[PDB]
Nucleic acid binder design. Sequence first.
RNA 1: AAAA
Lengths: 109, 113
Amino acid sequence: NKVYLANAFSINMLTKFPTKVVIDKIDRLEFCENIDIINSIGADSTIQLINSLCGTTFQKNRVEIKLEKEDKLYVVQISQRLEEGKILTLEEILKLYESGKVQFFEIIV
Amino acid sequence: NKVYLANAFSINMLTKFPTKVVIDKIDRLEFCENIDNEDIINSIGADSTIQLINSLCGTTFQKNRVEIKLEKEDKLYVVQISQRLEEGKILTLEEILKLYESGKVQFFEIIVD
RNA sequence: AAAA
């Protein structure tokens, strides 16, 4: 059983269909405790944010993950649709975080 | 029960937790038949994707980059790219057609809770 | 929110 970290969920993470995905929202403390795991976070500002929140030392690792049944995924998620192609800067993602728009999830396949 | 069309599935589409979704893969024909319907709520948020699906399906969608929020028993059809792209990539029509012809544009049906 |  593997555990992954990502900056979004994508259907491209799934390998077999149909599949059921169970999604729960968790708080910062639970997120940080559980990710302190295979990192796929693919944006620099997100790495900086989670390292600051959790005291971790992840580095950007923009790779494809493929989940199997009973794999688990932690997501740090932006709770707003952004402009096309948006890559958030540190200032931008911190502003979103401080406005309640960066949220944390646990996903079981 | 509402039906939506999108260019991805995102956790930001969900409103209540914990929740389940079930995701299944469908082919182009099934996708086109199910979205060529008057009830569907379009959220496709890139121009090339609109042009691609209109060409594949004979539809007349326009770009509508909005937030959808799914409730229990809602259904979602997704057209998406089957590969992780460079950061911030917005595919052109030529690019997305090439991906489509190489098997890298895939179609999904999602049932929420 | 085509893998924020």
